[PDB]
Amino acid sequence: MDYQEYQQFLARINTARDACVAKDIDVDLLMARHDYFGRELCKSLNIEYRNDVPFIDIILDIRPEVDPLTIDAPHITPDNYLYINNVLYIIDYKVSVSNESSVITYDKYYELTRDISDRLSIPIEIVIIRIDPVSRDLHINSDRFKELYPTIVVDINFNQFFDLKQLLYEKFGDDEEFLLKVAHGDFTLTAPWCKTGCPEFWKHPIYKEFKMSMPVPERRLFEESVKFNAYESERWNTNLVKIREYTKKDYSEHISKSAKNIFLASGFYKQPNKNEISEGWTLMVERVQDQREISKSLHDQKPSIHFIWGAHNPGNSNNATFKLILLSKSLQSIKGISTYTEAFKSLGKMMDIGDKAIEYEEFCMSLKSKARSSWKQIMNKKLEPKQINNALVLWEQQFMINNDLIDKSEKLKLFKNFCGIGKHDLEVSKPKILDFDDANMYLASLTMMEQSKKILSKSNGLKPDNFILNEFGSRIKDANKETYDNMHKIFETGYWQCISDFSTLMKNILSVSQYNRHNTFRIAMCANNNVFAIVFPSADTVVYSIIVLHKEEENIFNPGCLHGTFKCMNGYISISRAIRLDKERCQRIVSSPGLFLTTCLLFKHDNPTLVMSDIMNFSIYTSLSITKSVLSLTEPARYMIMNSLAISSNVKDYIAEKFSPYTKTLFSVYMTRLIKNACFDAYDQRQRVQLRQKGIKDNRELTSIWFPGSVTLKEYLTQIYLPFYFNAKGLHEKHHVMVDLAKTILEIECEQRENIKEIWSTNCTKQTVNLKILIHSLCKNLLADTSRHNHLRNRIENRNNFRRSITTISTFTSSKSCLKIGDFRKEKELQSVKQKKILEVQSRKMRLANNYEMLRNAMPNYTDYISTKVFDRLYELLDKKVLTDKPVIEQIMDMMIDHKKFYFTFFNKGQKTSKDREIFVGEYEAKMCMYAVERIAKERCKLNPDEMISEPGDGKLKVLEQKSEQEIRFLVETTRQKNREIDEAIEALATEGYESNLGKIEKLSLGKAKGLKMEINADMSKWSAQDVFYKYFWLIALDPILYPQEKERILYFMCNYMDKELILPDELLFNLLDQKVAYQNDIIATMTNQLNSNTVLIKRNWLQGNFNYTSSYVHSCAMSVYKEILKEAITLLDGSILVNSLVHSDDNQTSITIVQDKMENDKIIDFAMKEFERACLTFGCQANMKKTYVTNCIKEFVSLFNLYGEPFSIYGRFLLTSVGDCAYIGPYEDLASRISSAQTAIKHGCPPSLAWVSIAISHWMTSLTYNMLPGQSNDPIDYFPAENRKDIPIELNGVLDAPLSMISTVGLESGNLYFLIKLLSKYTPVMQKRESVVNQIAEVKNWKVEDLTDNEIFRLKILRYLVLDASILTPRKFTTAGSLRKLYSFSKYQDRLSSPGGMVELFTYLLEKPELLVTKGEDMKDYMESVIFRYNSKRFKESLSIQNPAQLFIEQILFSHKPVIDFSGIRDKYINGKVTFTEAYRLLMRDLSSLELTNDDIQVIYSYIILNDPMMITIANTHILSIYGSPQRRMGMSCSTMPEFRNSPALVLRAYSKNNPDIQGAPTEMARDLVHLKEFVENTNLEEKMKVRIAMNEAEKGQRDIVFELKEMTRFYQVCYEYVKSTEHKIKVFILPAKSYTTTDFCSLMQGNLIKDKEWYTVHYLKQIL
RNA sequence: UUGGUAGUACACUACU
RNA sequence: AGUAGUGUAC
RNA sequence: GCUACCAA
């Protein structure tokens, strides 16, 4: 270029300060380069350099004899032109590395010139002459133009333009307004996250391993790809395109070579058939018998259920004290001489009060009356046992184990041999199970089931009326009469009474066991006057034996836990074995009636074939399995049966390798059979499932699995997949799990260490990647995915808060576990000594019924650590100034370099699976690094159409549906196109003589096109443990949105992460060190150097959970190559194919649809499955062919189905959780937790009737928790003005009355909404009745408040004075702040207590910044102070101690008669010690006698609940204005998304508190928010209302009340926080009977769908629904 | 904080 | 006894 | 572990 021009540009660059000025430089730098090229080009072409000539000048140059006024010359201005030989060459110069500019220019110029061409007969050639400024190659489109100038030599250099453009861009590299302007249309960046890179990367051994293993050109291409800078390059994609083109040859060879395997394919793909199943079963038994200790003996059986049962005796009392006597005389009078009969007679004698009945009752009543006076426990007053006849009584139903009444070796017999207390080569023996495969052992199971059938299927003598039927039977019946009739059929049987009795007795056993002692036994009862339980001494878990009285002998339910039936005074007495269960398993039994009723009705649903008696017999044993045996069968059932009916599967290898029956239980022997039978039965009806849409019309052609009968496909899948959900959580033992996990991780590591060397390959070696195919696919995908969003790096920054402070991020301030490494020898040794002393104390005290320091010495290379809470580890790092309040990403970038050594540990999930899963726990700073990598991926997965782990909400279910609609349409129309010539030839030929000439009709109709659908439902194996981590190095390196600095640090981290060490936890080390015998081939010893170290180096296993987004993206890539191969292979058969593939971490749902005429379909299947496996292996995944299975109608994907187009789900899994899913806080709060399960089940397609049943079971379990059932102690019915429990409010443990449409949408808050809708529809005049909701509420002033019934007035008082500011009855517990020693931030809070006035300073800080009472705030100081303040809360401190739901459950029962309600906190919301539940009912009613409601109070209720909520106005409008069409049957359901009904809080509340909207942090729009906010303040008077509230308090108290000011400011600013916060719209997908488009559609569909099982109703509205 | 002493509190109670 | 287990536990 | 009391 020109010299003096360069000096001017170089000056403009130095003097520029704005980005607007810098942009103008860039514009002219580019135009200068364009001009420079043309001036040089024209010299080579030997033509006049014309600057920019209008088109009219061109015509006037070459054809003077033509009029400007007549011809309409196209309005363009070409850079040059050339007229020779009656041809006009219009010329345009370009300087781009791409010809996208050139093709726009060509098309514009070509299109316009056609019209003017015909009016002059001059042909026009549009010539674009491009030069690629980097290479310097020319590119010319016109074939005539190159025939004129065949040798163009523009010798030219652009280096001075790159030098200049560089200087400009280095100068404005951080100016984000520059990056915006400079940005092309298609791509935009933001400033670097760091200035320097990381040179220590390039020296790192793992990179050198990585590098050295690649071939040389790829090495250069990696280093080059790291160093790329999309902002400083000509175009963003050059490095990606450069690398795509280099790999293209090797890639398209691999695709073509792989596609031609279609012709090699035999067609003998792995199928299921009778032989495979028997061979699988026989190989399986061979394994199981080598692995277990088999037993053909029925006395080796363990309890199938931990209970024995007998019917009640209605000739006897059901009084507590009669029952106690009845048992005491029965035990003392046991006739005969058995091995334990002396012990039981003694126990009976030890509980013997004789005639002294009233003396017992009044003694017990007095002790109880003492405990219930106090909120806390009664301390320092000793419990003394009263002598009442032979019984020494410590408490109601607690009796001293008296030494006089039992020979002291019969006492030892009871404890040691019967209860196991203190009970006791080279090898350790195998686990013992029953021989499930032995036919005599099977018949014993078959017997037990037929024996249990006989007793339990008989009618109990009782009225079938219980809580569920009484309160909800009305609405269950209305939705479906059949399910009401079924409930009756269940409640009549002994089944239902047995399990109710086992539930109620267990509830009581737990209540009783709490305060049982080492020197006492206790007695539990139930409503059945013949069933009891003796709770033995714990010896520290719950020990017990069940006792049944009965008239005749063998007439008791014995599911394998009877010790013996004995003859006694009156009839017979049967006593169970001694059972020992942890409290978690016991809770499950309490909840079992809900499970049973739910299970029975669900299996029986809408099916006239099945017999209810047989269902109950199966369901009772499933509902009461609290033991591992059944876990071994329920989930494998899925794979065995589904593999058995698949088109392609591997039933042999699944059963052979994986299926491991664990039959300790006769019921599990019976069930293992039902599974086997079902595998064969599945094969036998394989053609009844697969095609030869019609899945919508569901007929009963399949054989039932678990009980005899006939079943539809939907009902058949529900039978296969539901059983898994009978599995309880927490059945595992930490002791055993920790070892199994530790050793499988180390086995995978040791295997890799010894055998797995090569990283790359070309023949699918185990644990390798095809390097060039990886590189090429990644390039194509990154190009594609980046292209479809231009601000991607910006999207990543905003959505994941990269720019904001670390303290504003929800995951970086959580209560999750978090590892930290350091020296903690003193803290851990002084824990050891404290638990030594306190164990020795309670050991020495227990003699009533008569180490860490070492570990460290044994481990020279130990690595100390301690787990803590994430927010606490953040506090710590901020305090020691390792972290700052700088933008999170900048600090993540520093951490990647700063944190060299990585450390992880694990704990056990306690999962419902047969083998328990591991959960990994890393350091805080490891979570910081992975955040960046994962959140980058996450946003790019959202752009990828295949990738679904990133799909928000329930979108998956709607995506499955849209694919199968698309695929069905493709199959049909594509088969119609390929046939129509043949179909017209045959159908026109078969008009004249359809019968005759049938040799010619089938001449052509064999050669017509064959349809083929196949659905691969795939699982992958060892997803995290056996990946090739090295492949992700390319994913980072190729990434155009990363700068080379960031890439360098990210890759350095990823190198360090492959050196990460796993810490075997101290719990596991103790267990292992305590082993007397050495373990044989001890993998844990091998990998620790004889337990010298507590760490093992883990390399290839990126730890499960950590890289799910990036791994899933690469899995999405493997499927793009699979699509490409299949597309080629089918074009070799001139066929048609559609391939879809959905990917979610290690789950896959690929869907092939093919039409071709050249080949047998079986060979195409054998091809597609082989190439599926290979596609996976070429990218480092391993498809698990024991679990993957192919159908042509059924897509399973992340436990969501699609059956012939129609979506389907096991809604039953959500219904089973409705029973035992709760935190145990209060009646409202617990019920709400349980109701949401029914809402989730509803949106997965639960029928209205079964949803009502579920809702009843929730109400039952909730009221049971706080002793609030009908007739019970805390039952509110008699304390309130109401004739039903649906008339009392839901907040005071009422019963929920609303339409199920309403409950689906708004939950418990529907209880009040509907009540207010009932009032409007009674107390507004008939003229106004036809109006919408806004007008009916406006008519509230003209209401006869006199006419309002008592009840309605009562409810409105609660809505006014209680509901509108916080779910009000809440038991408050007295418990301690257990185990906060670990928390760094807790000891700082403790120091702030010890400081003089230290807290008072902090409280006053938080009143001056009331923003922090309901946010965390952007500042560092603001985070740390708000943390220390939270420790002031009791509820927050109990959150950090590990929760225990069975204790939380049982404590909540026991304190239901104590005074646990703080009525001052309830009352002080209307003022101008503690109290019991029932007293709180009296005190609340009398407060309502001191209040009245005017017509303004009612208006205020309707305003807050209805009018100030768009959704509530809508839901109200729909119910009032709706009119229903006639009923109709559901014909195929459709997924529809629930629409949004609605229309910076941390800053806005700071801006509200101090009236400036001008804070160091983020304009006019945050001054607008304050004006919009102050509307809400002046309406409700809150600022000027709480001032009266505080001043009144401190005037009465006499001095300034600092804590009350905090509490009132909190509830003031918490009301402000719940206005200045948008409902971030979650995606909720609902299965409905038609498709929703509008918002009104969803409401009408919902309203019409959820009222009967039989049918659905269309719903319309008479006015608008907004 | 350690060392000592003496305690460590409650549901179901039902047409059966 | 019960719970757990081809890891010595409760 | 909690509670009351005592002793450094």
mmCIF file of C-alpha atoms (C1' of nucleotides) in Angstrom, chain A residues 306 423 577-578 580 662 735-736 1077 1079, chain C:
data_model
loop_
_atom_site.group_PDB
_atom_site.id
_atom_site.type_symbol
_atom_site.label_atom_id
_atom_site.label_comp_id
_atom_site.label_asym_id
_atom_site.label_seq_id
_atom_site.Cartn_x
_atom_site.Cartn_y
_atom_site.Cartn_z
ATOM 1 C CA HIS A 306 -41.918 -59.294 59.330
ATOM 2 C CA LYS A 423 -24.365 -63.646 70.086
ATOM 3 C CA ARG A 577 -39.307 -64.601 65.731
ATOM 4 C CA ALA A 578 -37.316 -61.697 67.187
ATOM 5 C CA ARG A 580 -34.575 -56.226 64.378
ATOM 6 C CA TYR A 662 -30.942 -63.021 45.771
ATOM 7 C CA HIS A 735 -20.168 -50.691 55.816
ATOM 8 C CA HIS A 736 -20.656 -52.934 52.742
ATOM 9 C CA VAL A 1077 -7.808 -62.117 58.425
ATOM 10 C CA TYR A 1079 -8.181 -60.425 52.224
ATOM 11 C "C1'" A C 1 -32.929 -64.106 65.981
ATOM 12 C "C1'" G C 2 -33.157 -59.911 62.644
ATOM 13 C "C1'" U C 3 -30.572 -56.617 59.173
ATOM 14 C "C1'" A C 4 -26.336 -56.511 55.811
ATOM 15 C "C1'" G C 5 -22.773 -59.360 52.861
ATOM 16 C "C1'" U C 6 -19.210 -64.179 47.342
ATOM 17 C "C1'" G C 7 -15.045 -57.477 52.682
ATOM 18 C "C1'" U C 8 -13.859 -59.832 58.683
ATOM 19 C "C1'" A C 9 -20.091 -55.216 60.204
ATOM 20 C "C1'" C C 10 -24.441 -54.037 63.368
#
